[PDB]
Amino acid sequence: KVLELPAYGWALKNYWLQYVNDWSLRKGDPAV
Amino acid sequence: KVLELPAYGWALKNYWLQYVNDWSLRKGDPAV
Amino acid sequence: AQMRVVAFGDQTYDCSEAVSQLLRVRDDAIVVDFLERAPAVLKAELARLSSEQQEETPRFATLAELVPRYRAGTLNPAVSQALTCIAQLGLFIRQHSSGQEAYPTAHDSCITGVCTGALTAVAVGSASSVTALVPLALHTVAVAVRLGARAWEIGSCLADARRGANGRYASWTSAVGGISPQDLQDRISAYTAEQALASVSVPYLSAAVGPGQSSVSAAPVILDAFLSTLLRPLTTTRLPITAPYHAPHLFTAKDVQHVTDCLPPSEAWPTVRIPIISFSRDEAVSRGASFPAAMSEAVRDCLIRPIALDRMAVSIANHARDLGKDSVLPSPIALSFSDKLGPQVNSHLPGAKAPTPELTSKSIPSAIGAEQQPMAKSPIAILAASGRFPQSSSMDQFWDVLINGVDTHELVPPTRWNAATHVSEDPKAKNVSGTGFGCWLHEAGEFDAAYFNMSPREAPQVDPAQRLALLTATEALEQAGVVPNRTSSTQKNRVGVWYGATSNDWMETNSAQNVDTYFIPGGNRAFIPGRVNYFHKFSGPSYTIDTACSSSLAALHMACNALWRGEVDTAIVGGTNVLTNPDMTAGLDAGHFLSRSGNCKTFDDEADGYCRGEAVVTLILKRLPDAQADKDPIQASILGIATNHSAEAASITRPHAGAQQDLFQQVLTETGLTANDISVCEMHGTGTQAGDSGETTSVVETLAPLNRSGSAVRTTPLYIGAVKSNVGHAESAAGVSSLAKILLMLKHSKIPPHVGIKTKLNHRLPDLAARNTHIARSEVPWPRPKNGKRRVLLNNFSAAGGNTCLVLEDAPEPEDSQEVDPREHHIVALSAKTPDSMVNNLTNMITWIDKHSGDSLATLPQLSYTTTARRVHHRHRAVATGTDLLQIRSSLQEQLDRRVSGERSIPHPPNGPS
Amino acid sequence: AGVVPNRTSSTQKNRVGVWYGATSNDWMETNSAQNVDTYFIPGGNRAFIPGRVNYFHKFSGPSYTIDTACSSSLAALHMACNALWRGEVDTAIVGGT
Amino acid sequence: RQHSSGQEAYPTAHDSCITGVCTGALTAVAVGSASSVTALVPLALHTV
Amino acid sequence: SFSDKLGPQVNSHLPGAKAPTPELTSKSIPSAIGAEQQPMAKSPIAIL
Amino acid sequence: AQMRVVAFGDQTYDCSEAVSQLLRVRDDAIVVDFLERAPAVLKAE
Amino acid sequence: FVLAFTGQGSAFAGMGVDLYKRFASFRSDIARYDQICEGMSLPSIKAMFEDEKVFSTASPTLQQLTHVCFQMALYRLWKSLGVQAKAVVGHSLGEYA
């Protein structure tokens, strides 16, 4: 019989790429 | 019997949005 | 010395229930084949009808569409006759194939029928086995269609559909009781001589049912006019026969020959071996004639001869008296007044009527593996489910947020995108959004890279959807206790991985700021299931499905099809939605989809859209026998699922309720469940007034029908709720989130409260109280019925017009051996790919032990089994031994103390011991 | 193919599914994303590729978009053939773009 | 297949007999304990 | 195996032997329209 | 007056081609059901 | 559409024989009418669409029956092609049909 044992103890670390400089609001403008 | 008659004569027109100002090469830069 | 009679009935018998029973049969290959081939022959024969008659015939994909029309009385004579024949033949075949009945023989059995059973009578007296019967049965179905069409044509020529019909087909005959046939004939003759009717429109005596009863047929108007002339103590009853039959003054041999012109000529036709009793004809016994000749005789009797129904019994008994027998064991199929057949027949015999024996148990057991039902349309068991939801990291925290009725919506955190620049109440700039709220996962970027053989630089460029899919898939596989290659059903090549996704925000806004080697593999959606197939070394299909806001359910459907077809023995069905591209929210707002105030106010009178909610979910699926043989933890079962499109909508986006109701009725019919069987309905409930009202109306109409008196048909309450008020709209994982809620509710036997309704109910909805349906505002007990199951209906709709829905059932009753493990000492093993993970596993294991210290004695043996035979053992290892659970706890605690003190863990040597 | 909706039993509006195979949506990432408007999501999203078909010809059967990197079209064909074999639909419009 | 798709009359105790060799005696027993293909399939699985 | 010799060997012990020459055949009843096609499970998928 | 004998062979007779033939049969439902149920019983044993 | 019906003025030999041969519905309607008429003890009207050599010696009752049967069959044939009558006018015999 399979019991509901705890989950694996993931050694979690933060891997994240950050949206920066609000470029998505200038999709089409030049460097003005 | 179905014959291979020509296709419908579409009254085609050009609907296009143009990628402008080369903003995809600056995904993250400020205006400066 | 006991004869048997196979007696079939006419259209008087209501055969809708028999049709449904036959359609529900699953465990008989021959019956399934016959029920699959009959509709095709029927449609082919219907395509050969006249122009007038083809506009009065409905379109049906399966015989499941002719039952409601047969009940409503809106079925034309041809289709009704064909359906009667199909029902009779299917009942006989099911009795004599699955029922293990000896086929009738010319020494102990006879056949009989009345005006539609004379066709099946010859069809059954010609064959000698079910396999030898199926093709003759299909021929007979075609002949019945033609017979009905001919009678319908003559009738429609003889009269017109009255202006007050409105779909129904008026009766052409009526039973008259209280006067002998020889006197009702005189009454008819006098009425004819007086009214001066045409010889073709005159009423006629269509049957002699008894010594003081008969059946008189005529056109509706003339029939009513003549019946009004009949006075007491004569009784009149209206039969459901919709065309003229048994009219020598309306049909000739030309019609008979036309009816039987769908049977190609040949010298290979079988004769009839089982004698057929033809009481209407001059000679009662009919044997030796070929198949088409006897078929034409039957058609002639049904169109030209009057039913001598007052001489059937005397005929059958006579047959029995010819062979020296002394009793009759009637075996009627779809016959009316069958209960009297046996006594009526035996009244003429010297006696010796005796009872019958038992069914003899199941009559031998089925070999292990042969007790199942075919893989086609089998229940799909759910083994385990894991997920990450807003303000949660497990299914238990999900239940915590649900049962407490929390609203998880909040402004956009600075990790995704700013709000002082990306949002405005009156958007004047480009790409700016009017809303900024959403239900997020604040630990989306939290991954164990080393566990999955991923570099520190490869990981930041993988879409968080892929990372969370890997995490949840691993967790769900652990919970299900399935190891690759462990058993037949878990072989690495029998495991497919379906998923549902609708965006690649990471590629568009996050990893596109600097393209690198992992750009494409990190971002592309096929890699979501590709990584799960690769890491676990699964060599089966790997698909991603994009149906917008139904993907996870659509993907689910795909998986089930595979499970039903045999492509895979196990499925890993997931659904992910992580929001990182602001323009997607801006465009959903500019399209007027997002609530500008807060969460989804489902059923609220001020519902003005929905709220976006991140979520990842993964589930493990197998066929029910596969999970039962492997001894897996079964949470729920899926009985059916279907999809269609809202094509008749008034626009591309807005929904349509008729298609939704059709879908619900289709799934209910395929699953064989009435409206009362369902107890809960997890509605799509996006929080739109029009959409909410339409979905509620469709759901209540399907599951909470209102009686003609205005009362309710449900004898038990029905509850409806929407997850999206708590956690929001996922747009790719909404179906899996709803399924997770249903699983948790089945686990805890509770119905959570509803939080969407903030101010007042929506005035557009039907009167739920009158229909016996409720929206629980406070948590409600949902106990599992004893000796029964709890059944649920789940729906998921998309902005592109796609509608998916499924039916869930409670898992079977678990029956453990309950035997005592005779052993004394037991082992508990733990493993990890990192020393820190080893410490975490030890800590969590001691915590679980503390929670489960005093459960029972089987806990330690079962824990040892789960830790040893149902796990994958990594490099870093730890073990404990004990005779009881406290010894295990103490040993593991000492090991944890050693590890924490500074005793670093070392992986075991790769080769192992010698 | 010379097939008209409702012409025959196999071309009824409710017996026609639409499977499509797509792997990218570039228009909504670089072309129509330069000015988001009312049709941003209906146009860009892949789920409408088959859906629009279903809408225009009033086909009321399933409508799927598949994404298998570079096997999308054959995977969609496999799904359509599974639907035909099982009996969900009588006709399929299998595409790839 | 011979006696179902081939439309062959099932053997009877008056016009037919069964026989087999080392592995064929099991099938002979299975076939002699049935009167039709439907009555044969479960015995066939038992024999397998 | 070696079945072709079974008949001659068996009949060798019987008088006459009535050398079996059965043909039968001609036992293909026509199928009702729509009943000739194989089941829709595992059927060819035509391209139009 | 002509009896018939149903005679079955042993492992000497190669039967791979007969197995393939039975596998490709599609116009008999009973045969398809038998060949779908036999592998399950074999696996269970 | 307004459907005008004609009297017994222009009933010529072998009229409506092309339709009786090139349309199965027309033939079925004519056979149905013939069977009904013979049921009513009326003379058979079948040869009037097959022989074409009995028109010369056709009795007035036979001629009128042929005219009315032809009118009914022709109207039904035209209706099956999608003709929606808005009003019906007749003549000496054109009123009945």
Coordinates of C-alpha atoms in Angstrom, one line a residue, chain C residues 43 59 61 377 430-431 502 504 508 524-526 542-548 554 557-558 561 564-565 567 583-584 586-588 590-591 643-645 647-652 799-800, chain D residues 6 9 12-15 23 25 28-29 33-38 40-41 45-48 51 54-55 58-69 75 78-79 82 85-86 88:
Chain C
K43 CA -28.7 5.7 -42.8
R59 CA -29.8 13.8 -38.6
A61 CA -24.5 10.4 -35.5
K377 CA -14.6 3.2 -23.4
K430 CA 0.1 52.6 -26.1
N431 CA 0.1 49.1 -24.8
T502 CA -1.1 29.0 -24.4
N504 CA 5.6 31.7 -24.3
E508 CA 9.0 37.1 -25.7
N524 CA 9.5 26.6 -27.0
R525 CA 6.3 24.9 -25.8
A526 CA 7.0 21.4 -27.1
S542 CA 4.8 14.1 -26.3
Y543 CA 2.2 16.7 -27.3
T544 CA 1.3 20.3 -26.4
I545 CA -2.3 21.5 -26.9
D546 CA -3.4 25.1 -27.4
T547 CA -7.2 25.6 -27.2
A548 CA -6.8 28.9 -25.3
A554 CA -8.6 19.6 -24.3
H557 CA -9.2 14.6 -23.8
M558 CA -6.3 13.8 -26.1
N561 CA -8.2 9.0 -26.5
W564 CA -8.8 4.4 -25.1
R565 CA -6.9 3.4 -28.3
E567 CA -1.1 4.0 -27.7
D583 CA 1.2 43.0 -23.5
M584 CA -0.9 39.9 -23.1
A586 CA -3.0 44.8 -22.0
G587 CA -4.6 43.1 -25.0
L588 CA -7.0 41.1 -22.9
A590 CA -8.3 46.3 -24.5
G591 CA -10.6 43.4 -25.7
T643 CA -15.8 18.6 -27.2
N644 CA -17.6 20.7 -29.7
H645 CA -17.6 24.3 -30.9
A647 CA -20.2 28.0 -34.1
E648 CA -23.7 29.5 -33.9
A649 CA -22.6 32.3 -31.7
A650 CA -23.2 36.0 -32.7
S651 CA -19.5 36.8 -32.6
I652 CA -16.1 35.1 -32.5
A799 CA -12.7 32.5 -26.0
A800 CA -12.3 30.8 -29.4
Chain D
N6 CA -25.2 19.8 -44.4
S9 CA -24.7 12.9 -43.4
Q12 CA -23.2 17.9 -41.2
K13 CA -22.1 21.0 -39.4
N14 CA -21.7 19.1 -36.2
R15 CA -19.5 16.2 -37.6
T23 CA 4.6 26.4 -33.3
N25 CA 2.9 33.3 -33.1
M28 CA 1.4 39.3 -31.8
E29 CA 5.1 39.5 -30.6
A33 CA 2.2 44.3 -30.4
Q34 CA 3.5 47.7 -31.6
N35 CA -0.1 49.0 -30.9
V36 CA -2.3 46.7 -28.9
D37 CA -6.0 47.0 -30.0
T38 CA -9.3 45.3 -29.6
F40 CA -4.9 41.7 -30.4
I41 CA -5.9 38.5 -28.7
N45 CA -3.6 33.7 -30.3
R46 CA -3.1 30.3 -32.0
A47 CA -6.4 28.9 -30.7
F48 CA -8.3 31.0 -33.2
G51 CA -11.5 28.3 -34.5
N54 CA -15.0 26.5 -37.4
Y55 CA -16.7 29.9 -37.1
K58 CA -20.3 27.0 -39.0
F59 CA -18.6 23.7 -38.1
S60 CA -19.6 22.8 -34.5
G61 CA -17.0 20.1 -33.9
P62 CA -13.7 20.0 -32.1
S63 CA -11.1 22.6 -32.9
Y64 CA -7.4 22.1 -31.8
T65 CA -4.0 23.7 -32.3
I66 CA -1.0 21.5 -31.8
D67 CA 2.6 22.4 -31.0
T68 CA 5.3 19.8 -31.5
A69 CA 8.3 22.0 -32.5
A75 CA 1.0 15.2 -34.8
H78 CA -2.4 11.8 -36.0
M79 CA -4.9 13.4 -33.6
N82 CA -7.5 9.2 -34.0
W85 CA -11.1 6.2 -36.0
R86 CA -12.9 6.7 -32.7
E88 CA -15.8 11.9 -32.8

